[PDB]
Design a protein around this ligand. Sequence first.
Ligand SMILES: *[C@@H]1O[C@H](CO)[C@@H](O[C@@H]2O[C@H](CO)[C@@H](O[C@@H]3O[C@H](CO[C@@H]4O[C@H](CO)[C@@H](O)[C@H](O)[C@@H]4O)[C@@H](O)[C@H](O[C@@H]4O[C@H](CO)[C@@H](O)[C@H](O)[C@@H]4O)[C@@H]3O)[C@H](O)[C@H]2NC(C)=O)[C@H](O)[C@H]1NC(C)=O
Ligand SMILES: *[C@@H]1O[C@H](CO)[C@@H](O[C@@H]2O[C@H](CO)[C@@H](O)[C@H](O)[C@H]2NC(C)=O)[C@H](O)[C@H]1NC(C)=O
Lengths: 635, 976
Amino acid sequence: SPMYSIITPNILRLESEETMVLEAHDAQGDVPVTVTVHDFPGKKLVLSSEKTVLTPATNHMGNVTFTIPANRERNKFVTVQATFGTQVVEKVVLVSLQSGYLFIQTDKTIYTPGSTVLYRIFTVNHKLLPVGRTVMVNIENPEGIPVKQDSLSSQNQLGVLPLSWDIPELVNMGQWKIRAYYENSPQQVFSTEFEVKEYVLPSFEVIVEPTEKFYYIYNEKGLEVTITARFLYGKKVEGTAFVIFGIQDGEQRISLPESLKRIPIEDGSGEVVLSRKVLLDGVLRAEDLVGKSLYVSATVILHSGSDMVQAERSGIPIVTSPYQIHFTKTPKYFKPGMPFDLMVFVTNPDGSPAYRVPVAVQGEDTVQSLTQGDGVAKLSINTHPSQKPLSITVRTKKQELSEAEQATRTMQALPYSTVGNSNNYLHLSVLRTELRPGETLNVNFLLRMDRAHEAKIRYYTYLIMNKGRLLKAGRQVREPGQDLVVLPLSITTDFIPSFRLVAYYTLIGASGQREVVADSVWVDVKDSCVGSLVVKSGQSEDRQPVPGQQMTLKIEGDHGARVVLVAVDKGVFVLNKKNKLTQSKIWDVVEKADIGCTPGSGKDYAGVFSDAGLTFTSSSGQQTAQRAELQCPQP
Amino acid sequence: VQLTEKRMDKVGKYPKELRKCCEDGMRENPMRFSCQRRTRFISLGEACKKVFLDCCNYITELRRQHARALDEDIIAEENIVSRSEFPESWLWNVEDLKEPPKNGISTKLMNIFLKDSITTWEILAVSMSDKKGICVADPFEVTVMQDFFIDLRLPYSVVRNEQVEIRAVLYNYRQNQELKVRVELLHNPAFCSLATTKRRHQQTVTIPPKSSLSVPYVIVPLKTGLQEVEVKAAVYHHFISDGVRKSLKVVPEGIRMNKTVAVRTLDPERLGREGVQKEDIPPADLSDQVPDTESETRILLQGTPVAQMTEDAVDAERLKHLIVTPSGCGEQNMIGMTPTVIAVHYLDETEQWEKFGLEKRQGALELIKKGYTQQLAFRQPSSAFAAFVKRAPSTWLTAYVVKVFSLAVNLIAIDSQVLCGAVKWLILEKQKPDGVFQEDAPVIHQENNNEKDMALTAFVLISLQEAKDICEEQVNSLPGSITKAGDFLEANYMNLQRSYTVAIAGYALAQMGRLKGPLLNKFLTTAKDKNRWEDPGKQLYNVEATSYALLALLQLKDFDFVPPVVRWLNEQRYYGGGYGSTQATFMVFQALAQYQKDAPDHQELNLDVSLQLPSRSSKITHRIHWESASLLRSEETKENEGFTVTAEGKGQGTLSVVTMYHAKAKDQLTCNKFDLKVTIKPAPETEKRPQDAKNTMILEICTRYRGDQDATMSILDISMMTGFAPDTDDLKQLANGVDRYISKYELDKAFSDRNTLIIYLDKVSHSEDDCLAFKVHQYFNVELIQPGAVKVYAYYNLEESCTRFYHPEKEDGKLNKLCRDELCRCAEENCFIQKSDDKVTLEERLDKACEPGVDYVYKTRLVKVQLSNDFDEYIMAIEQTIKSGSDEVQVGQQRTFISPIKCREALKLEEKKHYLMWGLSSDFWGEKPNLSYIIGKDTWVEHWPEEDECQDEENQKQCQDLGAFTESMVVFGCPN
Ligand SMILES: *[C@@H]1O[C@H](CO)[C@@H](O[C@@H]2O[C@H](CO)[C@@H](O[C@@H]3O[C@H](CO[C@@H]4O[C@H](CO)[C@@H](O)[C@H](O)[C@@H]4O)[C@@H](O)[C@H](O[C@@H]4O[C@H](CO)[C@@H](O)[C@H](O)[C@@H]4O)[C@@H]3O)[C@H](O)[C@H]2NC(C)=O)[C@H](O)[C@H]1NC(C)=O
Ligand SMILES: *[C@@H]1O[C@H](CO)[C@@H](O[C@@H]2O[C@H](CO)[C@@H](O)[C@H](O)[C@H]2NC(C)=O)[C@H](O)[C@H]1NC(C)=O
């Protein structure tokens, strides 16, 4: 009795390279395979041939990759054909009308009326390679009204679209936006915002910043702040400063009137404190403030002139712990009997990861671990083969922090299923490292099943899912009686920013029916460039630059590559600070487009495939559910 | 004892929606305005008033106690995220990497010149390879640093013979080392400095670490124009050899004036006579001219009444030349569009882009884009458009905006959402069921209450006919709304009294063809001389009304009434060779250009204008021809001559003649429609001014309209004195206060002739003076400064205005700064023959009086002295003409001798004492019969002792010297 498998991504993007992975379980000789796709329901036919031969000498491997043409256009669906001689398997898959990515660069985020906005539009596909499409670029004022409209193509420009706009000296104040969409996809629009404010050039600069990035509520020391003021040419200021503290409730601000203090400024340096006493008198009860944020307002009046500068530091997070703990990386499903690996995510109150945070599990600690630079550490707990849902709690245990200062977090992990009640599992485990392209990564295949059908399992099929597409496919051999097999996977620049790994095995079941156990795991790689680009001083170091001077710039990039440059004042660059066009911020947009949802595993045997962005369908009666939705469950 | 903190504690109470009114009430007032007084200027609810009143009541009593017994008194406020001015981005260029790769590494050297800014630059790079995709590089930091830096700090402008003290600021950036520097001001004969040709002026100064130093210089500018001031610096021990060379502008002693002299339509045939047209043009008055200033007469020939305008409306940097007024308000800002729109239309319909230049068009379209972009700043929810951003929306203004927008839909992209929402607004919300339109804002334009209803509906109905077949499907009840308004017109039209309305509403009715019979007669008989529809006093409105009447005449295709009207409109240019205001200009522009487009007459250009200036030997022969990119020609003369113009054969055009000169100060003699009292007083010395301000003063303006109804859109045009600058805090408070005494301030130095501050007002009360005051700071100390000017005027009727000058105060003997040495004696040399040495022998007199230049030699007796602030007038009676010039003068007649203010102390002429004077024919000033004299570098002034006092010791020596001179000049004269 044979078995024939068709494996395909969850949502099929039009006009793009898509892989239809085919196999053959238990078949004497080889069988011709042709795949064809139709509109559902209708005799349309978007692809005809594309044949592959399932050679026994190659374990029956099949690629057949094709791009679906875009034509007559409630969320559309396509019926896919998988003919293996006589018996044919079909699937109703969801279609996606999504071009790719537009990125918008702006030299500054704030402008004066009169000045020029220098912006570029980067046109790239799903592999983040440049592609020549038609794009439409608008400039809106804060009131939504478009004041500049352009239709331009991005071919021969190899990606880049340089544009310019002069702000008239009498114009709307506020957050002007730059909307940009592919003419192929007026549905999907990309935006960047900038301000116009108005000409304001203060005499001196004031920076108000606390000694701590946060406030610990029970800490009786209070929130100390350092007021620094100095002229634009580095003269230390002498004057007076009026500070006042307040609590921000999401986007509603409550001024604490009794926190207003008047301090003298001596040699550009000043000191003030918001006490816990006065803090709690601005509302009561301490715990209600955890999650709220504090802000300072500093007004510095000179001793010489009447000149006066204001400065505001807000978003100072009130915390019960200097650290956070997250389970957003950890799978939500465990396999009773097998070990369960936790991907604990530890962040500072602001959002950035925290290096070296000793963490352990509640109920049974010891062993411990150490956080990497990406703020992740792995923790495993072997629990009993129980059908009961597992509730885990992970605390932190940093040295030189009090026990009442640490952070705690709970998650709920539901059991597998093994339909129907056969208790045979597969566990994928990976080492948590700062892994860089070019290195090798060991992948552990753990088997747990009754000692009767454990000799029949000869191979594991593993599948790579990268950037929503199917990446690589292969096999993993197994000698009967083996409880663990390792896979040497060679990571390249094709796995950035992150890749999923689905592994499954199939056999004649314990009772009589087919059993197909599956599991998935998520692995993050160093989220940087596919190529590279470096800017440094071309001249032999020597001495520092001087105004109006000739200097040399070295550009270390990729052959044939096009490099677009701009030189901005550090004063506006550090003034962003959220619309920064980083490489990390580029991959973040690729991750939030990725499919699907669950950071690994599933509710059942085929709930794994859907939660990783795949549709498994058997020649028997074992398939995944139909995905009619494009996005995920609400965060 | 806190006051700053007792403040904000009071703002501490009161709900969120109210802290605005309390905050603004706690503030003081530039005027002495009281608490209750401040109210009723306040525009919000009465809940807002109750807080405002309670809070300044609270504070004015609290600081009223501070006087009884150096502490701050300001607001901490909320949310100012300041600093917007950052250095412009650069290196906006693209380079691809074509160097042979070394395992990916494709190094590409790139050479650049760093900007001359002391800052830290952030170079951002983004790669794009069709092999390996996009790659955003890390920021590269370059800290551009300089140890020593000079900044030369000069005033915006200095008036000739003023005494500015400039300063050279020097910065030492070194973090732990004080710089010693040798700094020098270089000699420039343009101005008296401490540096002369004799010896230089260098001095050593030591600048502390991480700080700056100011080095003052006194300069007395002798010549007008742009003069170069240069300080040079050589720092000790370091070979840092730096210097700064800026240019300060020395303006003359009065106020700039473009005086329109003539206009005259140039049309041979038409009443220009078969005796082809001859045109007499009188000399410009220039009676009030400033002694020793230039003038210039600009004669312009126009091939078409619209030509200068067409030329200007098309160009971006000459577009502002259509209007003498500021353009920072709802309807004023429409220069950005209106002229250009009609000008492009005009050239489209007459097919002239070919000869004129097609390149200019794409340029012209960009202006209308820009203008449109600007106009959107005035647009509110929903689509309503107000005269000032975030303020009560205007029915008149929206109507206007709807017109130009509707008439632009073809030229640039107009958002139909923006356009049709406005038409949707005017109709659904502003039109009464009677067909009339309502105005709920304060009126921008020309004020039973018919005609109020009749005029505004006329203006709105003219707007809706442009949106007719654009907002068809967008706005449902357009065609019915126009009908309602059209019906209201042809019923009440026969009751119209004001000549203005009869035209505008006449045109509105003409557009429908509903101006007929008895109504048409009404429209036609309202014109004086059958060439204009005009009203008493309302001058620039008559240019507006007449223009409409032309548009109505063209709408009726009645091309007999038209010629004389176009002639009249052609010549109503009293502010330069131009109509003055926006609404005036764009109205005549449209109509005159509409005449060009709707003419059944091939009125072609072959004009042959010849010019004979009595100053030039050669005639001037201009030939303006149709089919040549121009239709323009101009000529300049430095002399104020009366000349004669001759036009010949075929063409209807214009001949604008305008002279520019500098009229003296002196407050306007007959403010006929506006009252103005201007005051400047020293603020208390502990007021706390900005760190650079040497001295602060309070400037109070008080103005009142002389009409039976309030004046609408009006302007204060305040030109600061020299070195002075207005406190932008106080002006803000005046415009952004919950009270609000102002609609906005401009502070625009268009260019040159002293930096100006423009204040927009919604109205000027005719009931009482409308006072507002504000602080001015003096960032340089100056001596002998000339008065700054202030001008009020109605924005839409410039004919009504008032000009006053303001000046600190004497208090007995004006002071210099300084004398003590040659620097002071340098300045005085300029005026009056510098004796010095005090020899002055009889033999020395005869040599100097015999200069071939010496035209007159009088013995005068000083009758009256009328010393002003800018120039001194000495009225001298002639006692004996020892030598008469081209100016004959009788013994016993009087001549007025003018001297600069910087020479009063040197001349020291006491009233009713006798003098010996002489000088060149160059000294003569202002033609007969009454002549004046200018005491200049060639004017010998000397005291003539009286007879009763020739007995004294110091006099008998000097007495018979003058007696020997008197005879040896009458009896014998000059020997050679
Ligand atoms: C009051 O009446 C006076 C006249 O008495 C007028 O005020 C000024 O009058 C000047 C003549 O005395 C006018 O100068 C003309 O402006 C030209 C500007 O050049 C243009 O540049 C633009 C770039 O945007 C180009 O597109 C054009 O093609 C032109 O080239 C000057 O070229 C011209 O004289 C020049 O001066 C420059 C100085 O840098 C020289 O380098 C050059 O060799 C040449 O001699 C002349 O100055 C001027 O238009 C005008 N200034 C104002 C106010 O703009 C006004 O008509 C009246 N004032 C008002 C507004 O009431
Ligand atoms: C499916 O076919 C592709 C394309 O033939 C294969 O991927 C690589 O193909 C290139 C052809 O130049 C070979 O050099 C590589 O060795 C192949 N890489 C491997 C082994 O995966 C591959 O056979 C299949 N890849 C997928 C999408 O599973």
